[PDB]
Amino acid sequence: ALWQFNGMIKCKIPSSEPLLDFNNYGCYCGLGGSGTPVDDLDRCCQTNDNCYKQAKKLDSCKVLVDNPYTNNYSYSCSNNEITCSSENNACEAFICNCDRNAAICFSKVPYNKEHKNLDKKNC
Ligand SMILES: [Ca+2]
Ligand SMILES: [Ca+2]
Ligand SMILES: [Cl-]
């Protein structure tokens, strides 16, 4: 769920408010996404977007009355390291991994303010 994703990003980037810094950025960071990613951070979001898409394809996820944005899963942040729980069932575990990968990706690429609140005509 979005709440967990937010926590994961703060886990890797303690100085950030993910729902603000990583929302409405580039062509993919935020609800939806299309076009060519504008930078590596945007590409991180595209990958996470595609990961969610693959999740929806899983039989495990079709049974859930929740979407990746509201589907709660379990994880822990310790010493700024993210760990997905073995108590997560198939769908939740897949989503947890999608988010963990993105949070780590976000923390390893440049953040370009010029791409924040990007004019969708660039997508
Ligand atoms: Ca997106
Ligand atoms: Ca386009
Ligand atoms: Cl980690």
Which CATH number belongs to the domain containing residue 16 in this structure? 1.20.90.10
Nearest 10 degrees: CA dihedral of 12, 106, 101, 85? Answer: 30
Packing angle of the helix pair 2-12, 90-108 (nearest 10 deg): 40
Contact assessment for residue 71 and residue 91, using Cβ atoms and an 8 Å cutoff:
yes
Q: Where are the alpha helices (DSSP H) in the chain?
A: 2-12, 18-21, 40-57, 59-62, 90-108
Contact assessment for residue 99 and residue 84, using Cβ atoms and an 8 Å cutoff:
no
Contact assessment for residue 100 and residue 11, using Cβ atoms and an 8 Å cutoff:
no
Q: What determination technique applies here?
A: X-ray
List, in order, residues 6 or more apart from 84 with CB less than 8 Å away. Answer: 73, 74, 75, 93, 96, 97, 100
Residue 88, domain extent: 1-123
Kindly state the tokens that stand for 35.
Answer: 């076009």
Domain count within the chain: 1
Residue 36 CA to ligand 2 center (angstroms) comes to 8
Contact assessment for residue 2 and residue 99, using Cβ atoms and an 8 Å cutoff:
no
| Cα separation, 98 vs 19, whole angstroms | 17
Residue 83 CA to ligand 3 center (angstroms) comes to 7
Residue 102 CA to ligand 3 center (angstroms) comes to 10
